[PDB]
Amino acid sequence: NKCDVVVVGGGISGMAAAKLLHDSGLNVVVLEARDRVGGRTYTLRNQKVKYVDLGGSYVGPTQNRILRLAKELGLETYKVNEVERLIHHVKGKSYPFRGPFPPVWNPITYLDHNNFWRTMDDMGREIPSDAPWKAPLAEEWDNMTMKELLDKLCWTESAKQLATLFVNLCVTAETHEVSALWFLWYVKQCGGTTRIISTTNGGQERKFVGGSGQVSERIMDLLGDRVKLERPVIYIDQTRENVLVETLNHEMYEAKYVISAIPPTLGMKIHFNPPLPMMRNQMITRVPLGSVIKCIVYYKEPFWRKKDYCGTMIIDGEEAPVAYTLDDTKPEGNYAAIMGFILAHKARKLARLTKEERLKKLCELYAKVLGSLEALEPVHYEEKNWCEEQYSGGCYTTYFPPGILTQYGRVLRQPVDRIYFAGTETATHWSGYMEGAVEAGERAAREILHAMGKIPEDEIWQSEPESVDVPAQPITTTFLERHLPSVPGLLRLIGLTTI
C-alpha cells in the first residue's frame, strides 16, 4: 500500500535504483509485470546447459558500475574465449585473423576501411554524451539514416558491407531504420568503435559465472517481499498529494515519488492522470526496440579450438541466418556451445520457422564457416526471440529513427512531476547495456534523494572508480591509421599532383 518510492520495473535498472534507495533508509516497492526479475536479462537453468544467458550477458572494461554491483552481490566474471583465430566469412569463404578488426589487403579498400572507422569516431567527438542534440550538426545528421551516411562515406562495397553488419549487430536494426546522429552517439557513449566491437579489451571480454540474471535475483533477495512479481502497472495518478500507482491485479500503491525503470515506449502501457506533457506523449510512440533472436547450439566438445578457431565468427551474407557468433563454452571447458545472434529483418523472417528448422540452418551455416562436419552434430539447442516479449518490446535496446533524437531527445530523463526516469535508455555511458541500466537506476534514485533534500545537486551524477579486476587498456591509434588519406582524399591528391 504505502511507501516512499515505487519503482516500476524489476530489471537491472529498477533493482539498482531500489537497492540504493533501500540502502539509504527509504521504504521502496518494486512492481514487476513478469513472474520474474531480470527483464532483458534472463538466465535459463536445466541439466543440459547448467546455466545460460538468453538475454544480456557480456561485460567488459570501462563498465565499472555493473562490475562493482555484481561484485558487491558476490558474483564473479570469466573471459570469453578469444585465444585462437577469429573468422571473417564473406562471399562464401572463411578468412581467419587476429585482433579486433577483420584485416583487408587491397590498398584502396584498406584506405576506405581505415577511414570508415576513423570517421565514426571523428563524428562521435562532436557529439556530447549527455546531450547528443547539441552536436553542431545535430540536425543534418539526425535527418539522415545510417544507410545514407554509409552511401556517402564508403567508396568500396567491402567497407559498406562491413559497416552495414556493424550497425545491425550493434543496434539490432537495419541501416535505413536508424538516425545517423543517434547511432554515432550510441557508439561514442560506449567509448568508440574499438571498445564496442572488441572481446579482448572491449564490451564482450567477460560474462558472469552462473549468468547475469543473478544480479537482479540477488537484489530481490536483499529486498525480500518489497519486490512484487506479476504486478503490471496500468495507471499512475499524480493529481493528489501522494502518487497513486495501480496494477493490473487491482492493487493500489501510494508513494512520494516514482521511478519509471521500463523501456521508454513501454510507458505507453500506463494510463496517466494528468496526461503526460505533449513532448513525452509523442516521444514514447516514436522509439521502438530492435529485433533479435539469441541462439545457443551445444556440442560434445569445442571442436573449433582444435582447428585454431576461438569460435568467433563474423558472417556476412543475406543467405546467412546468423551474422555473429561467440564461443559460449563454460570456463571449466564443458557444455561446449556456439552463441549466435539472428539480427533485424532476419529475426522477422526466420521466426516463421520451427525451433528445429532454425537449429538445422545454424548447424549447416557453422559447418561451412568452420569447415567442419562436427558442426552438424548438435547435442542441444536453446533460443529466445525477444521480439515476442510484451514487457520488453524487443532487444537489445531502443533505437531512434531519423528526426526523433533532436526533437524529442531532451525529454527522455526529464522528470514529470514526481515521476523520474531510469532504464538503460536514459544512461550517458553504455546506454543499451546492463552498465547503463545501473547508471540510469542509481542516477534516478539520487535525483529523488535530492528532491527530498537528503543530498546536494552535485551528488546526483556520481563517477565510478575503475574496476581492479577488469582494468581498461586505453584505445590507441597508429600514425598511419590517423593520417592515411580517405579514398576521395587520395583522388584529390591525384588531381593536384597531375596539374
Ligand X SMILES: *[C]C1=C([C])[C]=C2C(=[C]1)N([C][C]([O])[C]([O])[C]([O])[C]OP([O])(=O)OP([O])(=O)O[C][C]1O[C](N3[C]=NC4=C3N=[C]N=C4[N])[C]([O])[C]1[O])C1=NC(=O)[N]C(=O)C1=N2[C]/[C]=[C]/N1[C][C][C]([C][C]C2=[C][C]=C([C]([C])[C])[C]=[C]2)[C][C]1
Ligand Y SMILES: CCCCCCCCCCCC[N+](C)(C)CCCS(=O)(=O)O
306 binds ligand Y (CB under 6 A): no
492 binds ligand Y (CB under 6 A): no
Q: How far is the CB of 272 from ligand X (least distance, A)?
A: 12
Count of chain residues binding ligand Y (CB under 6 A): 4
In three-state secondary structure terms, 253 is strand
Q: How far is the CB of 59 from a second copy (least distance, A)?
A: 27
d(CA 355, CA 349): 13
| Secondary structure percentages of the chain, helix, strand, coil, to 5 | 40, 20, 45
Q: How far is the CB of 140 from ligand Y (least distance, A)?
A: 13
Q: Would you say 262 or 487 has its CB closer to ligand X?
A: 262
CB-CB contact of 382 with 49 (8 Å): yes
Q: How far is the CB of 456 from ligand X (least distance, A)?
A: 26
240 binds a second copy (CB under 8 A): no
237 binds a second copy (CB under 8 A): no
CB-CB contact of 312 with 86 (8 Å): yes
- Helix or strand run (H / E) with residue 447: helix 434-451
- List the one residue out of 250, 287, 269 whose CA is nearest residue 399: 287
What is 38-101 written as a DSSP string?
Answer: BTT--EE--TTTSSEESS---B-TT-HHHHHHHHHTT--EEEPP-SSEEEEEETTEEEEE-SSS
424 binds a second copy (CB under 8 A): no
> Of residues 142-161, which lie at the interface with a second copy (CB under 8 A)?
143-145, 147-148
Q: Would you say 138 or 441 has its CB closer to ligand X?
A: 441
Q: Would you say 79 or 152 has its CB closer to ligand Y?
A: 152
Q: Would you say 234 or 451 has its CB closer to a second copy?
A: 234
Q: How far is the CB of 405 from a second copy (least distance, A)?
A: 12
d(CA 124, CA 193): 10
Q: Would you say 20 or 487 has its CB closer to ligand Y?
A: 487
- List the one residue out of 194, 190, 201, 195 whose CA is nearest residue 80: 201
In three-state secondary structure terms, 466 is coil
Q: Would you say 181 or 266 has its CB closer to ligand Y?
A: 181
d(CA 134, CA 181): 11
425 binds a second copy (CB under 8 A): no
Tell me the CB-side half-sphere exposure of residue 431, using CA atoms within 13 A: 26
In three-state secondary structure terms, 29 is strand
210 binds a second copy (CB under 8 A): no
In the list ligand X, a second copy, ligand Y, none, the entry touching 155 (Cβ below 5 to 8 angstroms by class) is: ligand Y
Kindly report the number of other CB atoms within 10 A of residue 357's CB atom. 11
155 binds ligand Y (CB under 6 A): yes
343 binds a second copy (CB under 8 A): no
In three-state secondary structure terms, 17 is helix
DSSP 457: G
Q: What phi, psi does 136 have (nearest 5°)? A: -50, -35
Q: How far is the CB of 196 from ligand X (least distance, A)?
A: 6
d(CA 39, CA 83): 32
DSSP 283: H
248 binds a second copy (CB under 8 A): yes
- Helix or strand run (H / E) with residue 361: helix 355-370
Phi-psi label, residue 332: left if phi above 0, alpha if psi -120 to 50, beta otherwise: alpha
- Joined together, the cell numbers standing for residue 457 give 545537486
389 binds a second copy (CB under 8 A): yes
d(CA 233, CA 218): 23
Stretch that binds a second copy, among 105-113, 162-170, 325-333, 381-389 (CB under 8 A): 381-389
Among 228, 345, 368, 380, binds a second copy (CB under 8 A): 345
DSSP 2: B
Stretch that binds a second copy, among 54-62, 170-178, 322-330, 461-469 (CB under 8 A): 170-178
152 binds ligand Y (CB under 6 A): yes
CB-CB contact of 114 with 412 (8 Å): no
Q: Would you say 155 or 298 has its CB closer to ligand Y?
A: 155
Q: How far is the CB of 467 from ligand Y (least distance, A)?
A: 42
> Of residues 274-293, which lie at the interface with a second copy (CB under 8 A)?
275-279, 281-282, 285-289, 291
Task: Give the pairing type, strands 28-31 and 227-228.
Answer: parallel
In the list a second copy, ligand X, ligand Y, none, the entry touching 314 (Cβ below 5 to 8 angstroms by class) is: ligand X
- Helix or strand run (H / E) with residue 227: strand 227-228
Q: Which residues bind ligand X (CB under 6 A)?
A: 8-14, 31-34, 39-41, 55-59, 101-102, 165-166, 169-170, 196-197, 203-204, 232-233, 261-263, 266, 269-270, 292, 294, 314, 324, 386, 391-392, 395-397, 423-424, 432-437
In the list a second copy, ligand Y, ligand X, none, the entry touching 488 (Cβ below 5 to 8 angstroms by class) is: ligand Y
Q: Would you say 180 or 233 has its CB closer to ligand X?
A: 233
Q: Where does this chain bind ligand Y (CB under 6 A)?
A: 151-152, 155, 488
Q: Where does this chain bind a second copy (CB under 8 A)?
A: 143-145, 147-148, 173-174, 176-177, 232, 234-235, 248, 250, 265-266, 268-269, 271-272, 275-279, 281-282, 285-289, 291, 345, 348, 351, 385, 387-390, 393-394, 401-404, 407
